[PDB]
Motif scaffolding. Structure first.
Motif, PDB file in Angstrom:
ATOM      1  N   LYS B  77      23.176  44.370 107.724  1.00 37.59           N
ATOM      2  CA  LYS B  77      22.655  43.355 108.538  1.00 37.59           C
ATOM      3  C   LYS B  77      22.035  42.183 107.511  1.00 37.59           C
ATOM      4  O   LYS B  77      22.379  40.781 108.119  1.00 37.59           O
ATOM      5  CB  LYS B  77      21.040  44.113 109.528  1.00 37.59           C
ATOM      6  CG  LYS B  77      21.690  43.852 110.150  1.00 37.59           C
ATOM      7  CD  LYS B  77      21.948  44.016 111.654  1.00 37.59           C
ATOM      8  CE  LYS B  77      22.762  44.628 113.243  1.00 37.59           C
ATOM      9  NZ  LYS B  77      22.491  46.215 112.263  1.00 37.59           N
ATOM     10  N   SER B  78      21.828  42.686 106.698  1.00 38.64           N
ATOM     11  CA  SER B  78      21.685  41.565 104.870  1.00 38.64           C
ATOM     12  C   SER B  78      23.298  40.618 104.499  1.00 38.64           C
ATOM     13  O   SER B  78      22.469  40.776 102.993  1.00 38.64           O
ATOM     14  CB  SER B  78      20.496  42.249 104.400  1.00 38.64           C
ATOM     15  OG  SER B  78      20.853  43.469 103.269  1.00 38.64           O
ATOM     16  N   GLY B  79      24.015  41.492 104.860  1.00 38.72           N
ATOM     17  CA  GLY B  79      25.173  42.032 103.946  1.00 38.72           C
ATOM     18  C   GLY B  79      25.733  40.032 103.413  1.00 38.72           C
ATOM     19  O   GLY B  79      26.100  39.585 102.651  1.00 38.72           O
ATOM     20  N   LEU B  80      25.245  39.151 104.265  1.00 37.71           N
ATOM     21  CA  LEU B  80      25.386  37.499 103.923  1.00 37.71           C
ATOM     22  C   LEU B  80      24.328  36.592 103.102  1.00 37.71           C
ATOM     23  O   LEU B  80      24.553  36.013 103.047  1.00 37.71           O
ATOM     24  CB  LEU B  80      25.462  36.876 105.553  1.00 37.71           C
ATOM     25  CG  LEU B  80      26.716  37.227 106.215  1.00 37.71           C
ATOM     26  CD1 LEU B  80      26.956  35.984 107.234  1.00 37.71           C
ATOM     27  CD2 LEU B  80      28.425  36.811 105.257  1.00 37.71           C
ATOM     28  N   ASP B 103      36.789  43.846 103.265  1.00 34.50           N
ATOM     29  CA  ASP B 103      37.199  44.854 103.162  1.00 34.50           C
ATOM     30  C   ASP B 103      37.757  44.508 105.376  1.00 34.50           C
ATOM     31  O   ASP B 103      38.983  44.492 105.775  1.00 34.50           O
ATOM     32  CB  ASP B 103      37.268  46.152 103.077  1.00 34.50           C
ATOM     33  CG  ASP B 103      38.484  47.030 103.385  1.00 34.50           C
ATOM     34  OD1 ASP B 103      38.940  46.744 102.560  1.00 34.50           O
ATOM     35  OD2 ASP B 103      37.367  47.776 104.178  1.00 34.50           O
ATOM     36  N   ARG B 104      36.387  44.163 105.744  1.00 33.78           N
ATOM     37  CA  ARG B 104      36.434  44.349 107.536  1.00 33.78           C
ATOM     38  C   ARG B 104      35.267  44.628 108.180  1.00 33.78           C
ATOM     39  O   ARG B 104      34.226  44.597 107.914  1.00 33.78           O
ATOM     40  CB  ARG B 104      37.463  45.447 108.679  1.00 33.78           C
ATOM     41  CG  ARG B 104      36.753  46.936 107.976  1.00 33.78           C
ATOM     42  CD  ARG B 104      37.668  48.163 108.727  1.00 33.78           C
ATOM     43  NE  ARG B 104      39.194  48.094 108.237  1.00 33.78           N
ATOM     44  CZ  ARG B 104      39.593  49.130 109.574  1.00 33.78           C
ATOM     45  NH1 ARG B 104      38.685  50.388 109.865  1.00 33.78           N
ATOM     46  NH2 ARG B 104      40.792  48.594 108.838  1.00 33.78           N
ATOM     47  N   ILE B 110      27.046  43.022 109.748  1.00 36.07           N
ATOM     48  CA  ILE B 110      27.346  41.641 109.719  1.00 36.07           C
ATOM     49  C   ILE B 110      29.038  42.167 110.558  1.00 36.07           C
ATOM     50  O   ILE B 110      30.608  42.090 110.579  1.00 36.07           O
ATOM     51  CB  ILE B 110      27.981  40.607 108.884  1.00 36.07           C
ATOM     52  CG1 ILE B 110      27.115  40.860 107.273  1.00 36.07           C
ATOM     53  CG2 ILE B 110      28.546  39.603 109.078  1.00 36.07           C
ATOM     54  CD1 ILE B 110      25.534  40.399 107.962  1.00 36.07           C
ATOM     55  N   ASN B 111      28.784  41.866 111.876  1.00 34.35           N
ATOM     56  CA  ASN B 111      29.651  41.566 112.581  1.00 34.35           C
ATOM     57  C   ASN B 111      30.330  39.633 112.693  1.00 34.35           C
ATOM     58  O   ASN B 111      30.290  39.305 112.301  1.00 34.35           O
ATOM     59  CB  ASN B 111      29.248  42.230 113.956  1.00 34.35           C
ATOM     60  CG  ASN B 111      28.754  40.903 114.925  1.00 34.35           C
ATOM     61  OD1 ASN B 111      27.844  39.854 114.113  1.00 34.35           O
ATOM     62  ND2 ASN B 111      28.234  41.232 115.997  1.00 34.35           N
ATOM     63  N   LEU B 126      36.631  33.271 107.859  1.00 31.98           N
ATOM     64  CA  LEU B 126      36.201  34.618 107.818  1.00 31.98           C
ATOM     65  C   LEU B 126      38.211  35.138 107.280  1.00 31.98           C
ATOM     66  O   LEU B 126      38.787  35.344 108.407  1.00 31.98           O
ATOM     67  CB  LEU B 126      35.760  35.083 109.023  1.00 31.98           C
ATOM     68  CG  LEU B 126      36.222  36.766 108.749  1.00 31.98           C
ATOM     69  CD1 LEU B 126      34.909  36.888 107.889  1.00 31.98           C
ATOM     70  CD2 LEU B 126      35.394  37.257 110.172  1.00 31.98           C
ATOM     71  N   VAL B 127      38.364  36.223 106.326  1.00 27.47           N
ATOM     72  CA  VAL B 127      39.415  36.645 105.899  1.00 27.47           C
ATOM     73  C   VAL B 127      39.346  38.242 106.257  1.00 27.47           C
ATOM     74  O   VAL B 127      37.888  38.904 105.278  1.00 27.47           O
ATOM     75  CB  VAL B 127      40.314  36.646 104.752  1.00 27.47           C
ATOM     76  CG1 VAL B 127      40.857  37.559 104.270  1.00 27.47           C
ATOM     77  CG2 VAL B 127      40.905  35.019 104.942  1.00 27.47           C
TER      78      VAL B 127
END
Lengths: 121, 165
Positions: B77-80, B103-104, B110-111, B126-127
């Protein structure tokens, strides 16, 4: 009738606009910035259009480009979607694909194709 | 001046150097990788500038930045958090191309909704390098994904040193 037509990217970049209403450039920019945000944020295809002020914003994504045609609430959104698709087919015929690159570097041809296909909105 | 596409990674598993080698394969200390963009409209000699941490961005790197590609870890959840720490620099540079790469997406982290909210707010796209799903068979005008999409996005840019054909 059609009020305006926008082509924009996933990054929010407006690559083509055609207006059938006379508005100062800063007014047009306020409108297009808002509309681009609204459309990009729609994650589920639950309608062909978004209601916005008194207009129906008929839109569809083709490759990485969004095509949006703003019409009146009472206007035929089904015919508008068909018109958008037919414009995309004209672009695909000339450029061999549907690419933002073509709209950036052959803007005048994309605009010419649109303008000569759509008569007055 | 040769433009730079500044590439970095906020993931501990996948580096900016790895991402750059994937880009180059298509048809701490800063590192520069020369890359010639060549398409029907122009060619442009740019550098893919791998900047492992933001505090190594010098004034002279900064003024050359015309694209920003940042990889992140979607698993938490903290990825950004670490990505958003680059935003003061990105709003200073004002790059025309801004790409958030993973990667995905992760439904447990982070959905797609949360990554999209962040990208639309900040002007990114977003890629995913390895989307879980293949595109729909009736998506007749599908969006490219992964490194092909990154290369397409970097082509769709008016680099300051374009040589027009």
């Amino acid at each position: 009738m059609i009020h305006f037509i926008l082509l924009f990217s996933r990054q929010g970049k407006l690559r083509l606009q055609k207006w059938y209403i006379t508005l100062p450039d800063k007014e047009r920019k306020k409108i297009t910035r808002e509309i681009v945000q609204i459309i990009l944020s729609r994650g589920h295809r639950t309608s062909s259009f978004v209601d916005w002020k008194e207009l129906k914003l008929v839109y569809k994504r083709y490759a990485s480009l969004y095509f949006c045609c703003a019409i009146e609430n009472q206007d035929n959104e089904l015919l508008t979607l068909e018109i958008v698709h037919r414009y995309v087919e004209l672009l695909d015929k000339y450029f061999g694909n549907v690419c933002e690159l073509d709209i950036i570097f052959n803007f005048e041809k994309a605009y010419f194709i649109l303008d000569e296909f759509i008569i007055g909105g | 001046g040769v433009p730079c596409a500044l590439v970095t990674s906020c993931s501990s598993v996948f580096s900016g150097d790895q991402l750059v080698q994937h880009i180059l394969g298509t048809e701490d200390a800063v590192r520069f990788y020369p890359w010639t963009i060549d398409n029907k409209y122009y060619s442009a000699d740019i550098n893919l500038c791998v900047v492992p941490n933001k505090f190594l961005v010098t004034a002279e790197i900064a003024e050359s930045v015309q694209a920003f590609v940042v990889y992140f870890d979607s698993t938490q959840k903290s990825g950004l958090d670490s990505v958003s720490s680059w935003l003061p620099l990105a709003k200073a540079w004002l790059p025309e191309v801004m790409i958030l790469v993973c990667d995905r997406v992760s439904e447990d982290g982070i959905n797609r909704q949360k990554a999209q909210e962040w990208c639309i707010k900040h002007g990114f796209e977003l890629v995913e390098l390895s989307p879980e799903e293949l595109p729909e068979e009736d998506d007749d005008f599908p969006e490219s994904t992964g490194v092909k999409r990154i290369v397409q996005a970097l082509n769709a840019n008016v680099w300051s040193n374009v040589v027009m054909k």
